[PDB]
Design a protein around this nucleic acid. Structure first.
Lengths: 452, 90
RNA sequence: GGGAGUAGAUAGGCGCUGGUGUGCCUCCUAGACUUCAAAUCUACGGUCUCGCUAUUUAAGCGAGAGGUGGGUUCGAUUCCCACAUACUCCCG
């Protein structure tokens, strides 16, 4: 057995075998990784052959020369796909970010007075105008936005929240787990499905420093279910002199009904003009911008949050800040169609079929392809609109040779990789999320997998 | 079929709490239980006014003064006055 | 593909039973009865395999297999469990 391993060549030897074949650096790395996988597989006695070695070492190299993170063509039809990187960015924004990152910028520098300045100052002007709030602020993400508001205003004091709003969004986020780490004391009122106003007003006391409500973004409850209206909570706060904090989460910057889509999703401007003292939300959801925790509300509160020594550990990076300002500039100019997430959901039903069939026209030739276009009702919103169900045209496909399962798998291994839905052994492609320049990339991928 | 069987037992006296075998009082809950253990497969059974109280009784019987673990998504409010959190407290 | 429900013979379709399996229908054959048909009636009947005699075969005899394995039991076709497989329904 100590001879079934002595066999395996030397890294000096393999590097030779790939003189100009591949960079020496990448060769040695793949040889090491490979050399280790063979020493262990032989020590546990699971390998009797070593011929696979040469072929494999070259595969690592081909792989290792390719970065782990890679752009992926989303065909699922889910605009806010938490898994695929939520809201993608308009090129207008990508270029403004590109420019500010290429070199130095006035990030923390005020050109007027020639002395350092707050980097959060560039944007805030935009927020207070769009929301109507007295002051604003932004941090890494909404997760931290919550965390910061709690440790800032309710460390050691009670915060009332509905028992139906103690959510678990994402894999590691849970209102109850973080608020605990927040230093705030959690007072849950009402019941899962129902919660009246009496429940809120009933748990108030000397320690109650905050009235908080979370928006059920990634789930919903139907059947006997009751919720406390927002106007009521504001009224309740102003009666006892207690602040109100709404975690919208979706981060919808404007009224959604104005675009044809009828939903009750809450938005900053309206929520603020309602009497809410503070409101937060992610920038990479319904806002359509880069990841960012956004907070807007009363000035005296914003100032309290900013001064928090923790705000410095959440303060946003140079990339998302810039990219955020250009996404905000678009909103002032009413350039709605320029932000991907917005355009994808408000696309004409007509619009969708138009792309549904222009793709089917590209696959009629490819061998063994059973191409059909169906009109189905799916749910566009992934991380912000749970209930929304909007019609969209999917081009359902099916090959005689391979099975739908095997199909999705090779497609995710393609370059670029394509992710799509599976329903009853039939691959589907929702056009709600597909960019036009992908249609050509789709056809070239399929003909390269079925005919090779 | 049921409405008539009820109609009959209510028209007059019955062996509600009386075991005809031994001629002495007996548990009225004894008539049914035979059915339940057979259909469910449980070791023993019992029945009370309604399920609201069924819960209430199991809790005060086995967990008065001690902790009971339950999912935060299952603290329901069924009906107008029933709420797992309000009754378990009581 | 992931779940779940339904499931299974020792001639073949449907149903049941902790007493060493059994009821209805069918096929077959066999027999009986018939002018004929029909009807009817009857069957510790039937597969496979292995070992034994006969040995073309039959024919007889003995044993076992209920998807596979295991367990409980005095006794498992029933019950339980595990795996596999078939039919159907929910989800990606």
């Amino acid at each position: 057995m100590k001879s079934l391993l002595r066999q395996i060549p030397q890294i000096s030897k393999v590097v030779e075998i790939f003189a100009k074949a591949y960079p020496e650096i990448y060769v040695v790395k793949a040889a090491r990784e490979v050399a280790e996988k063979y020493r262990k597989e032989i020590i546990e006695g699971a390998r009797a052959d070593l011929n696979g070695f040469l072929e494999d070492v070259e595969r690592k190299i081909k792989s290792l020369m390719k970065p782990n993170i890679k752009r992926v063509i989303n065909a699922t039809g889910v605009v806010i796909n938490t898994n695929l990187g939520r809201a993608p960015l308009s090129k207008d924004v990508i270029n403004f970010i590109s420019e500010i990152a290429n070199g130095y910028s006035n990030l923390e520098y005020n050109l007027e007075e020639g002395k350092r300045g707050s980097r959060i100052a560039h944007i805030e002007k935009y927020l207070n105008e769009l929301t109507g709030a007295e002051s604003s602020f932004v941090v890494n993400n909404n997760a931290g936005a919550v965390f910061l508001v709690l440790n800032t205003l309710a460390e050691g004091k009670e915060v009332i929240i509905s028992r139906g709003e103690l959510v678990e969004i994402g894999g590691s986020f849970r209102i109850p787990d973080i608020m605990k780490k927040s230093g705030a004391i959690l007072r849950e009122v009402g019941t899962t499905n129902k919660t009246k106003v009496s429940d809120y007003e009933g748990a108030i006391n000397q320690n109650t420093a905050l009235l908080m409500k979370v928006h059920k973004s990634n789930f919903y409850m139907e059947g006997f279910v009751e919720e406390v209206k927002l106007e009521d909570l504001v009224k309740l706060g102003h009666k006892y002199g207690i602040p109100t904090y709404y975690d919208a989460g979706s981060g919808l910057l404007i009224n959604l009904k104005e675009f044809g889509i009828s939903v009750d999703e809450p938005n900053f401007r309206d929520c603020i003009s309602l009497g809410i003292d503070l409101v937060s939300g992610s920038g990479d959801k319904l806002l359509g911008g880069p990841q960012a925790g956004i907070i807007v509300g009363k000035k005296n509160l914003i100032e309290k949050i900013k001064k928090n020594p923790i705000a410095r550990a959440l303060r946003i990076d140079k990339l998302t800040l810039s990219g955020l300002e250009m996404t905000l500039k678009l909103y002032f100019e009413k350039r709605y169609e320029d932000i991907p997430v917005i355009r994808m959901l408000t696309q004409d039903e007509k619009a969708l079929r138009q792309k549904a069939k222009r793709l089917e026209k590209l696959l009629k030739d490819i061998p063994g392809l059973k191409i059909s276009v169906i009109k189905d009702k799916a749910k566009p919103g992934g991380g912000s609109l749970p209930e929304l169900e909007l019609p969209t045209y999917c081009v359902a496909i099916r090959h005689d040779r391979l099975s739908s399962q095997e199909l999705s798998r090779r497609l995710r291994l393609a370059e670029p990789p394509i992710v799509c839905r599976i329903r009853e052994d039939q691959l589907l492609f929702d056009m709600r999320t597909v960019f036009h320049e992908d249609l050509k990339t789709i056809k070239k991928t399929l003909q390269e997998l079925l005919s090779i």
